[PDB]
Amino acid sequence: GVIRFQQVSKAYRGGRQALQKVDFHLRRGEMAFLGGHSGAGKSTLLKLICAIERPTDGKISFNGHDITRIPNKDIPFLRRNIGIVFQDHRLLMDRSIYDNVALPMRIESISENEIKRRVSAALDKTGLLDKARCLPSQLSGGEQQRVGIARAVVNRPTLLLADEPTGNLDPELSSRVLRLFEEFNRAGVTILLATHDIHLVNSRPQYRHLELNQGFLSEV
Amino acid sequence: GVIRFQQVSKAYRGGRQALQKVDFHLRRGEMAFLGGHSGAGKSTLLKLICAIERPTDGKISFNGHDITRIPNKDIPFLRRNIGIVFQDHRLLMDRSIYDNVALPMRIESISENEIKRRVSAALDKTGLLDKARCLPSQLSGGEQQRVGIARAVVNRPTLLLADEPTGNLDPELSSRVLRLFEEFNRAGVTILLATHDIHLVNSRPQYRHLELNQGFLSEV
Amino acid sequence: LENANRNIAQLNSNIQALETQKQQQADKLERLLQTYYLTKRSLTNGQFFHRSADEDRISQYYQHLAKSRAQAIEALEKTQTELNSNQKQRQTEREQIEKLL
Amino acid sequence: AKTDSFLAIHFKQAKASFAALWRRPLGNILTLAVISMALALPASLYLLSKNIASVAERVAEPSQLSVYLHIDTPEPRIIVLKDDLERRDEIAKVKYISPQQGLDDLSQYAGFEQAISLLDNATLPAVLVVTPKVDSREQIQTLAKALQAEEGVTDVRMDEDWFARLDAIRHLATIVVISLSSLMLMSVFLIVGNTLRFNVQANKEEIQTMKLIGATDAYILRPYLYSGMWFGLLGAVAAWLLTALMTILLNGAVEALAQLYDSRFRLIGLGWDESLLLLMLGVFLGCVAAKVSAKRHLKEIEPV
Amino acid sequence: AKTDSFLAIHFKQAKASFAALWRRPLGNILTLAVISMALALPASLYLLSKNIASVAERVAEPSQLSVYLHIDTPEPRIIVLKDDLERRDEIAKVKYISPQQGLDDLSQYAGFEQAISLLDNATLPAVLVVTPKVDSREQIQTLAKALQAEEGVTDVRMDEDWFARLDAIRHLATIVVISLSSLMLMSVFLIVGNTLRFNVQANKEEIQTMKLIGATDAYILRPYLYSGMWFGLLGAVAAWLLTALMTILLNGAVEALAQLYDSRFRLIGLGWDESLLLLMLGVFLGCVAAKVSAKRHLKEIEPV
Numbered sequence A, B: 001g002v003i004r005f006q007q008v009s010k011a012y013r014g015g016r017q018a019l020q021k022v023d024f025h026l027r028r029g030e031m032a033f034l035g036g037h038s039g040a041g042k043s044t045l046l047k048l049i050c051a052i053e054r055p056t057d058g059k060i061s062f063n064g065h066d067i068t069r070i071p072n073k074d075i076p077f078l079r080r081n082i083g084i085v086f087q088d089h090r091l092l093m094d095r096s097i098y099d100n101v102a103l104p105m106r107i108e109s110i111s112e113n114e115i116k117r118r119v120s121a122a123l124d125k126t127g128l129l130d131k132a133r134c135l136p137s138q139l140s141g142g143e144q145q146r147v148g149i150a151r152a153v154v155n156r157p158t159l160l161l162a163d164e165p166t167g168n169l170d171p172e173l174s175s176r177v178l179r180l181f182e183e184f185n186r187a188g189v190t191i192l193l194a195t196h197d198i199h200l201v202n203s204r205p206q207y208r209h210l211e212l213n214q215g216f217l218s219e220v
Numbered sequence C: 001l002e003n004a005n006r007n008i009a010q011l012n013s014n015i016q017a018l019e020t021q022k023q024q025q026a027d028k029l030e031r032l033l034q035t036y037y038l039t040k041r042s043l044t045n046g047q048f049f050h051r052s053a054d055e056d057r058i059s060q061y062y063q064h065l066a067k068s069r070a071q072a073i074e075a076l077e078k079t080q081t082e083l084n085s086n087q088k089q090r091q092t093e094r095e096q097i098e099k100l101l
Numbered sequence D, E: 001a002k003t004d005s006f007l008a009i010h011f012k013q014a015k016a017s018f019a020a021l022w023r024r025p026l027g028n029i030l031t032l033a034v035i036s037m038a039l040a041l042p043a044s045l046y047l048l049s050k051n052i053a054s055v056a057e058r059v060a061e062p063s064q065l066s067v068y069l070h071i072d073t074p075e076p077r078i079i080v081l082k083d084d085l086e087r088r089d090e091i092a093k094v095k096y097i098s099p100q101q102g103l104d105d106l107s108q109y110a111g112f113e114q115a116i117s118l119l120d121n122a123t124l125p126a127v128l129v130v131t132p133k134v135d136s137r138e139q140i141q142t143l144a145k146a147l148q149a150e151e152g153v154t155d156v157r158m159d160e161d162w163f164a165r166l167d168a169i170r171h172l173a174t175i176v177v178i179s180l181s182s183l184m185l186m187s188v189f190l191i192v193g194n195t196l197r198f199n200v201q202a203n204k205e206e207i208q209t210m211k212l213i214g215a216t217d218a219y220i221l222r223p224y225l226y227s228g229m230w231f232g233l234l235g236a237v238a239a240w241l242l243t244a245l246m247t248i249l250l251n252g253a254v255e256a257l258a259q260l261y262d263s264r265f266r267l268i269g270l271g272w273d274e275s276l277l278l279l280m281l282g283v284f285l286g287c288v289a290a291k292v293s294a295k296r297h298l299k300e301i302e303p304v
């Protein structure tokens, strides 16, 4: 599958354990919510998946390739396949929106014309094509979040990871962001959303829900 | 009163206006919620109150002293009276918790013994006396937020400003943090909480609620 | 006492020879010191590097002169010490002769 | 609410700033070493300039001419000859050195104390100094010939009088010293500022937090001032030590050179006054550089 | 997926890095000035050293061999030794100096117009000088030393660099050269490192986002390498200009001194081949310092 765990567990240096014997499987195209409490291991799970921090106990398989002991020189290639969205909508205030959204392509050293067309397509898909030449300061919060999503999804990622993307938005914009994620999933992009908002997850029961509780994953 | 506005309005350089003819009055001891939508002027209001950004149209009075054109050399004295809490719980990861909570006192160059006793009192009041010698990394999110509140309130502020203090916590810890703020208000510390969570404000109708909508303050 | 008399004569002859050598070496040292006083060549007064001269050869001359002076003073000290020791012993021999007398 | 004494806070800040240098050893050590070297080099250049100036001042004498009388010449005869020479025209002045005064001058040199004592009666010739009224070399030669033929002397000695060459060398050395000293002072002044800027940038988060609280500007500024002062003091002390270790070697080399001839020479090191001025200059430069750089970089930092 | 060629990306990075220096003119100008001065110091020192060496070589380059006979040898044997030396090959030209002639030379050296008295005729030993008939300096010196040893000559002072000796040139010059080279390396290798560390720190968020997306380390590093290379090149050019200005400044002072002496001389600037070496050194130091410091500082910056 797109990702699989085999009794993976993480123990921090202090001695506190975020994850203990967590096992779940994702099939291509599916979407998940990964609910948890104020503690739990949501952020630790999202950090583990994209290889920012290595595990200790088990093994991780992305597409049948072990990621347990991936050499540090191969991490960028793995990260190129995964798009990440954060609550903080990390954006470079100095540069323009067209530059922020184009960074993943320019990292690969792609020709300028293809970059332009692809970025225009992505911004149109997220509805920000008009303001492609403005700075992120002028945009409102929801526009900034949508720009972040576009930047994450520009490079045709196989798996899209969201870390509480709706932290800084009221429910009105929460609905719009969730609908945008649903559209991207319909396009065929696997997603693993992470949120502690029980109301939002209970709103839409179509997608399988995994609850994370004190480092244990019930998967129900 | 503890703070008063007279037709104050702010216009950004881009031409967008966060605030337009906002007028409200706070009497010592009161508490307010300052509800708003994803846009509105909650953060701009909290920035204006503590003199981080100056207004354009009206005037601001703190304790009968004009703050409209306060000279830049008097800003630190004003800020010493105001405690500020942020959603990000800005903490210095390098230093210890006892050092983080003691920074407001050391800024005034207070004797070490008084600093120790006052910091111990504050940490005991917030329930973190046990972990006064540990680093902020080891603490969980709620503990970090409580440490931030203690650091804000250590210096006996007359007015305490909170900028969505419960952004990164599930409702279970939201209740605890709100109860802590209520206890501080009972102690006699004026508070102006700011949040977009309608459920939390609707939970407790005792405190006057000010709704901020597209830069206009209904005050109802 | 008779034997000491011959030793006394030998000591007197040695003392006379030492006095002659001392006078000769004193004259030699005096003239050499006067020559040095004439040819000081102090640097701090700009007395160095005379124009158009064999600097290496003149330096060798100066070094040889200084070495000769050092040897002369060393020899003078040696001979003076020997003469003083002999005179002290000779005086003691006379004192010993007094005890015998 | 009690506040520490004015001096106590400054002393605590100075101690904390000194302790701060241990955070990053490599960068601080390298900058301190570079500061010490850049302050030592101008010191050595100035030392050489001062030595050359002293020698030039000594050589300033107007080609004074020395006359040696016979050792056995009677003292009244020497006095009469000196009076006659003074009476004679074309002689500016006459100075008479007694045999024992010359003996003392000779004994000043090392290695001569023993010989003088050993000699029963050391008798140097009476040395008389006559300063020609006209500095012309031809006049000097004519006067020397006349004195030699005066029939009351045994030898005559004349000076080199190479004033122009030494003046030109002194001018060249002055220009070189000024240029190199200016370059080194500018380099050391600018090096300090960069390190202070980097240190300020390092702790951006703490400065933001402090300014968010009602901290004053002076409180934020003081630690960097004291770090700059410590840099200056340590650099100046190291520079003084290096200057001493260099002047010892230079004195050894010059003594070896002068040993080729029978005479000896010693270098005049920097005086007690010079060291204090060096420390003052180092401290002033460090403090000013730190203040200006830190303040300029601090104006451009906003709490949020 | 179209991808740019190997050279296109490098050229774009070079142009962009050069353009980036104008974002912070003062910070990147002070560092350039410091590098220029630090590199120009040793350049000017080398220039002066080369000029004085050329003057020393130009003054005279003859070859003569001197032999000192022992004082013990009596006068009649001097003629026999002279005849024996003349008979032997490679001794075509010989000059002999009598002890009286040596005494006269010594008297002249001290400034006396006539030979000084009260020195006797045994003041100095006789000296002979032999010209080098064979161009082989080593073989000629060995043969002369062997001949002098056979004849019992006390010393054989063959002409050589007596002034250089083993005291000044052997130790002091080498120590000064090493100190100046160390100062040049440290000052350039230091300020370049600090400036690039500051630049990396100023781009913490951008580097974090770039690493998170999946950019390779080399892509992150290259812009700072090119910034350091530009720093080095511009510093070398500025140093060359500064040395040229210094030579222009000293031309008049050197002309005044050279005129007084017989040898007319003119300052000579750095050779056109030396400028290439200077630029190569500048760029090499810049690139090495940038790589090392940037990599070391970029190790400790995690994406989150």
Ligand SMILES: Nc1ncnc2c1ncn2[C@@H]1O[C@H](COP(=O)(O)OP(=O)(O)O)[C@@H](O)[C@H]1O
Residues within 6 Å of the ligand: A012, A013, A014, A016, A017, A018, A036, A037, A038, A039, A040, A041, A042, A043, A044, A045, B137, B138, B139, B140, B141
């Ligand atoms: N750098 C760290 N060192 C030690 N413990 C940590 C560290 N980071 C997180 N933890 C702890 O590990 C557990 C994981 O919590 P986390 O998944 O990050 O919560 P959330 O999903 O709300 O962000 C928590 O108890 C947290 O306090």
Ligand SMILES: Nc1ncnc2c1ncn2[C@@H]1O[C@H](COP(=O)(O)OP(=O)(O)O)[C@@H](O)[C@H]1O
Residues within 6 Å of the ligand: A137, A138, A139, A140, A141, B012, B013, B014, B016, B017, B018, B036, B037, B038, B039, B040, B041, B042, B043, B044, B045
């Ligand atoms: N630095 C800025 N320049 C121009 N406009 C800004 C700036 N900061 C905020 N704004 C705009 O002014 C308005 C104030 O919004 P704000 O009160 O900060 O929302 P929130 O309370 O959710 O943080 C918003 O429309 C925002 O986009």
Ligand SMILES: [Mg+2]
Residues within 6 Å of the ligand: A042, A043
């Ligand atoms: Mg989290």
Ligand SMILES: [Mg+2]
Residues within 6 Å of the ligand: B042, B043
């Ligand atoms: Mg806000």
